[PDB]
């Protein structure tokens, strides 16, 4: 588990500092985004994952991956692939997938 969570801290650090991370560093404000609340049932973002890691809320690295993948599933559900947020989400999703795979 210490091995699991060490990897999680590395990959989240790397995602938080990525150029394409800007749509995911804070929760979407649904008051500012028409339709977000109706369409996205389980919002997720990097600061929520950071907060959860800080309070010890992740037991395994599979839990952590489920949150990361939820970020990018939400992104592809709500944003067009050719939108600014959609393009950034594909960059971040490919980064995470490839980085997760050269560990496990
Ligand atoms: C276009 C709105 C949007 C942002 C976004 O612009 N920001 C993230 C929140 N903090 C400020 C910047 N991020 C996402 C994942 C979305 C949507 C609708 O999926
Ligand atoms: Mg693949």
Swiss-Prot record:
Residue stretches making up the Bromo domain: 2-103
Localization recorded for this chain is:
Nucleus, Nucleolus
Q: Where is the signal peptide?
A: none
Task: Quote the PTM field.
Answer: Deacetylation by SIRT1 in late S phase enhances pRNA-binding, allowing de novo DNA methylation and heterochromatin formation. Acetylation is high during S phase and declines to background levels in late S phase when the silent copies of rRNA genes are replicated.
Tissue note? Expressed at moderate levels in most tissues analyzed, including heart, brain, placenta, lung, skeletal muscle, kidney and pancreas.
Q: What does this protein do?
A: Regulatory subunit of the ATP-dependent NoRC-1 and NoRC-5 ISWI chromatin remodeling complexes, which form ordered nucleosome arrays on chromatin and facilitate access to DNA during DNA-templated processes such as DNA replication, transcription, and repair. Both complexes regulate the spacing of nucleosomes along the chromatin and have the ability to slide mononucleosomes to the center of a DNA template. Directly stimulates the ATPase activity of SMARCA5 in the NoRC-5 ISWI chromatin remodeling complex.
> What do we know about how this protein assembles, alone or with others?
Component of the NoRC-1 ISWI chromatin remodeling complex at least composed of SMARCA1 and BAZ2A/TIP5, which regulates the spacing of histone octamers on the DNA template to facilitate access to DNA. Within the NoRC-1 ISWI chromatin remodeling complex interacts with SMARCA1; the interaction is direct. Component of the NoRC-5 ISWI chromatin remodeling complex (also called the NoRC nucleolar-remodeling complex), at least composed of SMARCA5/SNF2H and BAZ2A/TIP5, which regulates the spacing of histone octamers on the DNA template to facilitate access to DNA.
Q: Domain notes, please? A: The bromo domain and the PHD-type zinc finger recognize and bind histone H4 acetylated on 'Lys-16' (H4K16ac). These 2 domains play a central role in the recruitment of chromatin silencing proteins such as DNMT1, DNMT3B and HDAC1. The MBD (methyl-CpG-binding) domain, also named TAM domain, specifically recognizes and binds a conserved stem-loop structure the association within pRNA. Binding to pRNA induces a conformational change of BAZ2A/TIP5 and is essential for targeting the NoRC complex to the nucleolus.
Assigned protein family: Belongs to the WAL family.
Record-given protein name: Bromodomain adjacent to zinc finger domain protein 2A
Which species? Homo sapiens (Human)
**Which gene does this sequence derive from?**
BAZ2A
User: Which residues of the complete protein does this chain represent?
Assistant: 1796 to 1898 of 1905
